[PDB]
Coordinates of C-alpha atoms and ligand atoms in Angstrom, one line a residue:
X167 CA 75.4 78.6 20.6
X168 CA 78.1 80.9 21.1
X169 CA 78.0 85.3 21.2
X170 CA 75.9 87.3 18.5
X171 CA 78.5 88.6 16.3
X172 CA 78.5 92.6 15.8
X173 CA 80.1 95.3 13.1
X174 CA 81.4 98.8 14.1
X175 CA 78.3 101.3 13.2
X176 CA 80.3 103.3 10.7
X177 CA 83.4 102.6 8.7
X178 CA 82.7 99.1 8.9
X179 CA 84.5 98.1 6.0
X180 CA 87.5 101.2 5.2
X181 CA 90.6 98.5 5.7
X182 CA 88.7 96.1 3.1
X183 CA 88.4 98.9 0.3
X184 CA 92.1 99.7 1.1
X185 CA 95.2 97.8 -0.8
X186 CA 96.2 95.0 1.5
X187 CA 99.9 96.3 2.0
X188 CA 97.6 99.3 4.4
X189 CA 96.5 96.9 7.2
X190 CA 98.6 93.6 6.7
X191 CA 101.3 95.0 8.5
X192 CA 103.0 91.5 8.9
X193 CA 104.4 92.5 5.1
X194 CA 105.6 95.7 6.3
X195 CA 109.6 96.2 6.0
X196 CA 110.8 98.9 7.9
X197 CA 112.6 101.3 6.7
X198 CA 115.5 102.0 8.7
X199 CA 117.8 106.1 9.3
X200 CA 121.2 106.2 10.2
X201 CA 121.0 106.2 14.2
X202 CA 124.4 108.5 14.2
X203 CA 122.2 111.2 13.4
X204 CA 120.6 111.6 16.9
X205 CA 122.5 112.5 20.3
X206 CA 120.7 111.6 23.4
X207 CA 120.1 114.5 25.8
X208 CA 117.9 113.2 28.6
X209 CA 115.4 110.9 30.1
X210 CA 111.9 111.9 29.9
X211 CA 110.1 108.6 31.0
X212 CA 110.1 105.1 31.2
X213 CA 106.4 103.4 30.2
X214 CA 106.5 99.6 30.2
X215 CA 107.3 99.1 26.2
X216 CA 109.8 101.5 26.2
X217 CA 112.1 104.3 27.6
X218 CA 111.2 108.1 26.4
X219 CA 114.7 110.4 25.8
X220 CA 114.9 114.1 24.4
X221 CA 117.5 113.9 21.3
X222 CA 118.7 116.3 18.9
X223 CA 119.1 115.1 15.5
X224 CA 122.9 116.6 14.5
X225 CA 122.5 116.8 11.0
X226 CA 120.2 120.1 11.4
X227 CA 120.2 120.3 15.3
X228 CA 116.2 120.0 15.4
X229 CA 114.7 118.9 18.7
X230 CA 113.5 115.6 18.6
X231 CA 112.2 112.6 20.7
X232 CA 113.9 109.0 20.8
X233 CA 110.8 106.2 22.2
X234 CA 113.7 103.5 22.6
X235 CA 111.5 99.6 22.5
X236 CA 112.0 96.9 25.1
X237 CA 111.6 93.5 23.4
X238 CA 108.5 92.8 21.5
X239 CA 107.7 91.0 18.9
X240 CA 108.1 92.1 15.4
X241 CA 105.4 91.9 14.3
X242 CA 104.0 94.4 17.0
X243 CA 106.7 96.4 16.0
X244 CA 105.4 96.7 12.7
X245 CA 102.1 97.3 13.4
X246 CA 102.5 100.2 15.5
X247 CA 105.2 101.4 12.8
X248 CA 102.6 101.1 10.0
X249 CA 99.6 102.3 12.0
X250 CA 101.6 105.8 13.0
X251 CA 102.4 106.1 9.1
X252 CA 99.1 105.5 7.8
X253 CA 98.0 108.0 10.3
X254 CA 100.5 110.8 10.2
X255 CA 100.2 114.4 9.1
X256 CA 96.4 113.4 10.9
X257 CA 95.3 115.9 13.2
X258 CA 96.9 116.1 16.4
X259 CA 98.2 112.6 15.9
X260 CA 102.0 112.2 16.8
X261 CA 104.2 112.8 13.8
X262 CA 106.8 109.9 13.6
X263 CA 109.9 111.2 12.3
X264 CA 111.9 108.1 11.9
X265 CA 113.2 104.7 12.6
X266 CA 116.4 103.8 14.1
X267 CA 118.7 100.4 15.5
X268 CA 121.8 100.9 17.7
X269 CA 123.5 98.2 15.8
X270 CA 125.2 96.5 18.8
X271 CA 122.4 96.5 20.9
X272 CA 119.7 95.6 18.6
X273 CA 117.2 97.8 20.2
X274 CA 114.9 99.3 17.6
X275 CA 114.4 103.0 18.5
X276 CA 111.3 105.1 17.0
X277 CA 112.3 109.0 16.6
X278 CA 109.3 111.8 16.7
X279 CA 108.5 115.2 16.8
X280 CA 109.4 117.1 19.8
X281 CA 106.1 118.7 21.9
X282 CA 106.8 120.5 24.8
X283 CA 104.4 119.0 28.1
X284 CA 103.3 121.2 30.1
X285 CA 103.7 120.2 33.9
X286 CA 100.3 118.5 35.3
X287 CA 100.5 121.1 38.7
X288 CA 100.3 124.4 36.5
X289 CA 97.9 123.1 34.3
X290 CA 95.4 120.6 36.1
X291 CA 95.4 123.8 38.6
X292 CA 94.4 125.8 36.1
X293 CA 92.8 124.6 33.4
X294 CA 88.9 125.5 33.5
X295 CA 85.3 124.4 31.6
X296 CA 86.2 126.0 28.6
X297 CA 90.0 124.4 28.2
X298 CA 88.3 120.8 29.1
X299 CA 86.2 121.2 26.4
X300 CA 88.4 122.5 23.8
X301 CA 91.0 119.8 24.6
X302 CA 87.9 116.9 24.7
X303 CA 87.5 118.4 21.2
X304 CA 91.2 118.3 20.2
X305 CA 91.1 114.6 21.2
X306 CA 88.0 114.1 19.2
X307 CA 89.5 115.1 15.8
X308 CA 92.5 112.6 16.1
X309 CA 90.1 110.0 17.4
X310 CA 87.6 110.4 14.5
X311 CA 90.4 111.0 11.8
X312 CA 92.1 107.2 13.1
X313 CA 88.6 105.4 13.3
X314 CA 87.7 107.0 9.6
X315 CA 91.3 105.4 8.7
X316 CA 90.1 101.9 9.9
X317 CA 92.2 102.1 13.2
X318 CA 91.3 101.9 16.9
X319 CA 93.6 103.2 19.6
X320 CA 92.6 101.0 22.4
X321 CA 94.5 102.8 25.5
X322 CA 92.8 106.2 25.2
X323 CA 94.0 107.9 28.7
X324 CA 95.5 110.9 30.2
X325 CA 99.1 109.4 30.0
X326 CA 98.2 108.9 26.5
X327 CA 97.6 112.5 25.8
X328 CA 100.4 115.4 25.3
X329 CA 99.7 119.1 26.0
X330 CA 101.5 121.8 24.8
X331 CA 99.2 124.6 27.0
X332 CA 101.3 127.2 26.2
X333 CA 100.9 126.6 22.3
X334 CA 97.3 125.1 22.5
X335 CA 98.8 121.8 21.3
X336 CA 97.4 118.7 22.0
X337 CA 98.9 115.4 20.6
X338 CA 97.4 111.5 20.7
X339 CA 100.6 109.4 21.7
X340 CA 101.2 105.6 22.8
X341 CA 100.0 103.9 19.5
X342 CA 101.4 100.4 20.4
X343 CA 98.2 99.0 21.5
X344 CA 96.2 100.3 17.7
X345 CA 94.9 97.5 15.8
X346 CA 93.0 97.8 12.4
X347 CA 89.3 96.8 12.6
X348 CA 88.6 94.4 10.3
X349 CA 84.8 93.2 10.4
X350 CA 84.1 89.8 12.1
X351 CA 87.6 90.3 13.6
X352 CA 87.7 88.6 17.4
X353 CA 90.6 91.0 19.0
X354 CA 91.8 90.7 22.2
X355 CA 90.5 91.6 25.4
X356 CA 93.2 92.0 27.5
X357 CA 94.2 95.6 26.2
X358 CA 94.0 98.7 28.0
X359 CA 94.4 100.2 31.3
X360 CA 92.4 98.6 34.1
X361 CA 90.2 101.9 34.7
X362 CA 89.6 102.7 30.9
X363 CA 88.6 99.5 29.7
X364 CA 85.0 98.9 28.1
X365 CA 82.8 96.7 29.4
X366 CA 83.3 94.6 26.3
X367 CA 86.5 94.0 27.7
X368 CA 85.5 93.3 31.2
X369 CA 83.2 90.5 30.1
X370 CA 85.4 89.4 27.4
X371 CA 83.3 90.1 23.9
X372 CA 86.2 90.2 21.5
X373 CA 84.2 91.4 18.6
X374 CA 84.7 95.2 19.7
X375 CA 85.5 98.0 17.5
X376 CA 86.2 101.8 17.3
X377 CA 83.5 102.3 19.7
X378 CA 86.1 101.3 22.7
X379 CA 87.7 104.5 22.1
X380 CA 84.6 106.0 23.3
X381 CA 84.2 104.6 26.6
X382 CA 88.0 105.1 27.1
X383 CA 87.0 109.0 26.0
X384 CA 84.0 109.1 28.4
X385 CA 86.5 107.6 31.4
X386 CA 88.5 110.8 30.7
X387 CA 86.0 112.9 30.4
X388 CA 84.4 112.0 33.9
X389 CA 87.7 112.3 35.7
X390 CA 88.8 116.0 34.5
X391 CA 84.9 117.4 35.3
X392 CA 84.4 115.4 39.0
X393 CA 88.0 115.7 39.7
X394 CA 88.4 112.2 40.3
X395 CA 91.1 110.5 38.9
X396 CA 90.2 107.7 38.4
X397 CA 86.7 107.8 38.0
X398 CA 85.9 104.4 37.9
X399 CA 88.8 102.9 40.5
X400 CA 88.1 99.0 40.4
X401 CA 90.7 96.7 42.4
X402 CA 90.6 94.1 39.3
X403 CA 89.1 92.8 36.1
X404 CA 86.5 91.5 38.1
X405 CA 86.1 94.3 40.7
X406 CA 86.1 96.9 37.6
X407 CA 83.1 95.7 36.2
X408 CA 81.3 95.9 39.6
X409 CA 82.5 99.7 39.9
X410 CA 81.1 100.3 36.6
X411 CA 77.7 98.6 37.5
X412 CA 77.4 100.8 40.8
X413 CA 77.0 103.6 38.8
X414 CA 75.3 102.6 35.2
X415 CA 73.1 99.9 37.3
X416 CA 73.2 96.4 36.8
X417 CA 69.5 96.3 34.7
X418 CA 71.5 97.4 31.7
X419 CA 74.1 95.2 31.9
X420 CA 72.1 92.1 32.0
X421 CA 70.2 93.7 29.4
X422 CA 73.8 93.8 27.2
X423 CA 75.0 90.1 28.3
X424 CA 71.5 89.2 27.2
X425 CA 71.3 91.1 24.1
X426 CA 74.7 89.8 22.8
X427 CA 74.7 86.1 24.3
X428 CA 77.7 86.8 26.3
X429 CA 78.7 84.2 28.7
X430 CA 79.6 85.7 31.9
X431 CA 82.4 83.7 34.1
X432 CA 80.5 82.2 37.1
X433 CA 83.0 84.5 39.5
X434 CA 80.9 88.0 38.3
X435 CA 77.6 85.8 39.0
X436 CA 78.7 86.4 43.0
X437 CA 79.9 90.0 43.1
X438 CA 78.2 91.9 40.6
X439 CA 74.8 92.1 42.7
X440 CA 71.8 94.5 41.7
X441 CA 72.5 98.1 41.9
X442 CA 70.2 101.6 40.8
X443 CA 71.6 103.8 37.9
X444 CA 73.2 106.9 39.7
X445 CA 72.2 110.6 39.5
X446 CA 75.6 111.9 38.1
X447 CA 74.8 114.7 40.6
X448 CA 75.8 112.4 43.2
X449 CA 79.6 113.1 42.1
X450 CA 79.0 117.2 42.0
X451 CA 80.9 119.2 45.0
X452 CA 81.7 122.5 45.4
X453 CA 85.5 121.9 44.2
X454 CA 84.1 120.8 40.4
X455 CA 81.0 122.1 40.3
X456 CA 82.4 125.0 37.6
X457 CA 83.6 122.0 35.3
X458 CA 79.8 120.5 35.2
X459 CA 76.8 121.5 33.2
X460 CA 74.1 119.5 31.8
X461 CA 75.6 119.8 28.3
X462 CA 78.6 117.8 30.0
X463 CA 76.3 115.2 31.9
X464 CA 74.3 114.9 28.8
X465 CA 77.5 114.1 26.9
X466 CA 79.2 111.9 29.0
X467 CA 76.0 109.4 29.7
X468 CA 76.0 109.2 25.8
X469 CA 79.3 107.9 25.7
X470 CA 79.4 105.8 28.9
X471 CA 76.9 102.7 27.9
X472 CA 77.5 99.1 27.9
X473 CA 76.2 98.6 24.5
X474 CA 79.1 99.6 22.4
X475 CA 77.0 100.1 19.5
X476 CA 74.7 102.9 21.1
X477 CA 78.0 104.7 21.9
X478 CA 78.4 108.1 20.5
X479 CA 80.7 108.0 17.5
X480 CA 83.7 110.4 17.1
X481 CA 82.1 112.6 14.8
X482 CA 78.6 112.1 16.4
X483 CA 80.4 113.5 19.7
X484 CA 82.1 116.3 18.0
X485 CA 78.5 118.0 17.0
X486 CA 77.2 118.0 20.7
X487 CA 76.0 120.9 22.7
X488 CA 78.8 120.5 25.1
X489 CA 81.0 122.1 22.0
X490 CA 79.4 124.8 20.4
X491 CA 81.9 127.3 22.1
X492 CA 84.9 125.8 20.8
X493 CA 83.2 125.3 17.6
X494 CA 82.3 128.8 16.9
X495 CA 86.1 130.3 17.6
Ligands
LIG143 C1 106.2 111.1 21.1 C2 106.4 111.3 22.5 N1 106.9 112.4 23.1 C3 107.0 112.3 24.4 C4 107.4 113.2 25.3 C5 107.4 113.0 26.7 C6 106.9 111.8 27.2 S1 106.7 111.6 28.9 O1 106.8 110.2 29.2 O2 107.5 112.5 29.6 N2 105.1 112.1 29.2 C7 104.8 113.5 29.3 C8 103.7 113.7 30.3 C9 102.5 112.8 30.1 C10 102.9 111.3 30.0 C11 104.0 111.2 28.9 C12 101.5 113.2 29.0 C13 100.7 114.0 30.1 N3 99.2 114.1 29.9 C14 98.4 114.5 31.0 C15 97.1 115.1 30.6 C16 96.4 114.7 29.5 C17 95.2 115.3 29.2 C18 94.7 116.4 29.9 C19 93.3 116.9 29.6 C20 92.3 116.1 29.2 C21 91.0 116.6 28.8 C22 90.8 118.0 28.8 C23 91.8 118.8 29.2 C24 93.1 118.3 29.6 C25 95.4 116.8 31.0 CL1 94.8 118.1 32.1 C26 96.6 116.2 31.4 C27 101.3 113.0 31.1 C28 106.5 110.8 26.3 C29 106.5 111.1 25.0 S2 106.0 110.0 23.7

């Protein structure tokens, strides 16, 4: 008779207490600037949905940055449009200045704030326990402040995540995968990158909420401490799971199929096996070893578990041991 059905833990219900126009983004009409007003200086990526460019806006010469859409849907359009304006002026959440068309070639162009990117090499060189966990905590804020405004990321990564080290800036970016939770809502699986996506995803439980952030989070997390990026390196859907269950053990994934009546594809029946819960100790060397501590281990296992709904929350995470440093500046 089907999956049990589940609600997000906290802010189950902020989009339903909210005017419609805030989530039902199929109403939105977008309002468009005058694309004149930004010059194009250079490519700064290319990412799939779109093609990143430096700009300078003429009218007062301000530094800015042009995300230039390949075709999508409008609707998806809109969504992302009205999720980054619900959300802006939020801490460390990307500040969308504006929204243009070139008029010939139909593209729809969205313009933000400039932040400078550090350079991986002089920074994942030098970076340090006390940077990861400040950083962590930067991320935390903006992923708190979006779930408490009844949105949910969905593509938490590295790639996702801007650094200004130099300023001790850190900005949340990429928010065309966000989606409003809605309680009772079945949302689609097939989100995220392969080595960030939640077990719910994996076995295809579409009732998910905010708590996918967390895993995504806890992915992170694991690669910047072990240096090992990524940490969990699956060679498919399927093949992801099974690297997942190597390390949390298969007991407590049956124990979550069970739990939540999810109907696992035959395939997973042959590959996923029986595997032990690891030590995390097992992924300690002498290169990392000054990125782990047990506040860190303790952390992370709270955030990496099937069961989205023993997941730390944002806020939940924020108050943990493995920040009481950071807190205190
Ligand atoms: C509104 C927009 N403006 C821009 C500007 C440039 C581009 S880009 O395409 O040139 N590009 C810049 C470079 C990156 C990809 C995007 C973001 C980087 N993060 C890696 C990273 C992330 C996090 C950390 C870290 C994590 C935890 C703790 C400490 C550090 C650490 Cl150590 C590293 C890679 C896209 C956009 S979208």
């Amino acid at each position: 008779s089907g999956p049990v059905p589940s609600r997000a833990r906290v802010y189950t219900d902020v989009n339903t207490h909210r005017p419609r126009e805030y989530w039902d983004y199929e109403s939105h009409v977008v309002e468009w600037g005058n694309q004149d007003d930004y010059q194009l200086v250079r490519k700064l990526g290319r990412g799939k949905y779109s093609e990143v460019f430096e700009a300078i806006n003429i009218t007062n010469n301000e530094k800015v940055v042009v995300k230039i859409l390949k075709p999508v849907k409008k609707k998806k359009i809109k969504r992302e449009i009205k999720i980054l304006e619900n959300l802006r002026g939020g801490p460390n959440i990307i500040t969308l200045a504006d929204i243009v068309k070139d008029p010939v070639s139909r593209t729809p162009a969205l313009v933000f704030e400039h932040v400078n990117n550090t350079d991986f090499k002089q920074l994942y060189q030098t970076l340090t326990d006390y940077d990861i966990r400040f950083y962590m905590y930067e991320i935390l804020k903006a992923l708190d402040y979006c779930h408490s405004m009844g949105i949910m990321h969905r593509d938490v990564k590295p790639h996702n995540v801007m650094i200004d080290h130099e300023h001790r800036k850190l900005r949340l970016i990429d928010w065309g995968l966000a989606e409003f939770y809605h309680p009772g809502q079945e949302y689609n699986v097939r989100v995220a990158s392969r080595y960030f996506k939640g077990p719910e995803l994996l076995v295809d439980y579409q009732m998910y909420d905010y708590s996918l952030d967390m895993w995504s989070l806890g992915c992170m997390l694991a690669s910047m401490i072990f240096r090992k990026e990524p940490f969990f390196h699956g060679h498919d859907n399927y093949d992801q799971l099974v690297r997942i269950a190597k390390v949390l053990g298969t007991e407590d994934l049956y124990d979550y199929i069970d739990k939540y009546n999810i109907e696992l594809d035959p395939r997973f029946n042959d590959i996923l096996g029986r595997h032990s819960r690891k030590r995390w100790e097992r992924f300690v060397h002498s290169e990392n070893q000054h990125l782990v501590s047990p506040e860190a281990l303790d952390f992370l296992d709270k955030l990496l578990r099937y069961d989205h709904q023993s997941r730390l929350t944002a806020r939940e995470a924020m108050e943990h041991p493995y920040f009481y440093t950071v807190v205190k500046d």
